């Protein structure tokens with residue numbers, strides 16, 4: 242019997258089957274619920290006037306265990322089209338996930354869905370597994386939160402884990418903020434989803450910011466026009482790289498927190514001095530926020546500056562790194578060596594939700 | 599006996615060579631057909 246793997250992201254839930262190289266279903270982690278029953282995903286956002294939506298996952302952490310229960314319900318029965326009673330499921334948790342959540346996670350899976358066996362795996366760790374490693378630091382930047390997760394021989398180093406409350410939402414929000422004064426009113430929830438599309442197609446990161454800012458102020462070689470549902474076509478200049486620049490400069494949106502290139506450096510410097518070289522030489526990038534073109538070489542430049550001048554700094558960033566965390570799960574579950582690491586239901590009834598640690 | 603089984607699963611992922619385009623092609627096919635469910 243083939244297994245199921247379901248990555249529960251803050252913004253989007255990615256789910257499919259163990260063995261596949263790509264997830265099968267991708268939909269927003271959103272539950273809408275009128276005061277009359279309750280809709281999930283793109284259904285829910287289609288009716289913002291009738292419904293009131295709630296993201297059950299905030300910053301990688303599950304906060305709504307009833308709305309989450311119906312997200313998992315929607316995943317199995319609607320999107321995947323499969324009875325969870327006959328297939329083991331691998332779920333993903335955020336780094337530093339409370340043991341309480343994990344015990345709820347298993348409890349729901351076995352009692353509500355009657356899953357035959359299960360396992361939870363840290364999101365960032367699966368990203369590392371996808372690139373065929375067990376050692377290296379992972380930059381997992383997604384929709385809600387950005388993490389720096391040092392991993393050594395499978396386990397993460399929690400004390401060394403850096404986190405940045407800045408992601409796809411903040412970027413899409415800052416893109417609105419900068420496009421608004423060039424002349425262009427983008428302020429409502431409808432106009433946001435096209436600004437998000439602006440972000441995902443025409444935004445890159447600069448290698449040298451100030452240099453690129455000077456190039457734009459002189460010519461329009463970096464010009465880009467868009468097209469709002471309604472037939473207008475636009476010009477966006479320096480906005481293309483000033484948007485993802487906030488990832489390296491949180492100062493842009495009034496954050497005194499450090500950029501993702503410094504949080505990477507800091508995260509490694511707190512690890513054991515044994516490992517630091519292996520971390521420098523295995524900097525894997527994961528998540529959809531890392532999908533900006535040129536972000537590897539910008540990270541390459543910024544880390545070589547901070548790190549010891551002689552140090553080997555390799556930055557892995559696959560083209561599939563948007564679903565990197567899921568593919569790691571798809572791999573791990575299909576590995577024939579992993580099936581004894583499954584947590585069977587025959588045990589959960591014998592030990593309880595506490596079993597999953 | 600856990601650490602034993604837990605290393606066996608790590609040598610498996612260590613001895614793994616990722617095929618980035620059988621992935622990126624399977625990603626771009628699945629993405630293509632999601633994007634098609636937009637009839638109206």
Ligand SMILES: Nc1ncnc2c1ncn2[C@@H]1O[C@H](COP(=O)(O)OP(=O)(O)OP(=O)(O)O)[C@@H](O)[C@H]1O
Pocket residue numbers: 249250251252253254300301381382383384385386387408409410437440441442527528529530531532533563
């Ligand atoms: N080419 C792209 N360029 C920039 N951003 C992109 C791109 N593709 C997708 N995204 C953005 O990355 C986010 C979705 O990626 P991801 O699935 O990793 O988020 P998530 O896992 O749901 O949230 P989190 O990791 O915080 O729990 C979105 O904010 C999306 O707008």
Ligand SMILES: [Ca+2]
Pocket residue numbers: 249250251364383528566
């Ligand atoms: Ca994620």
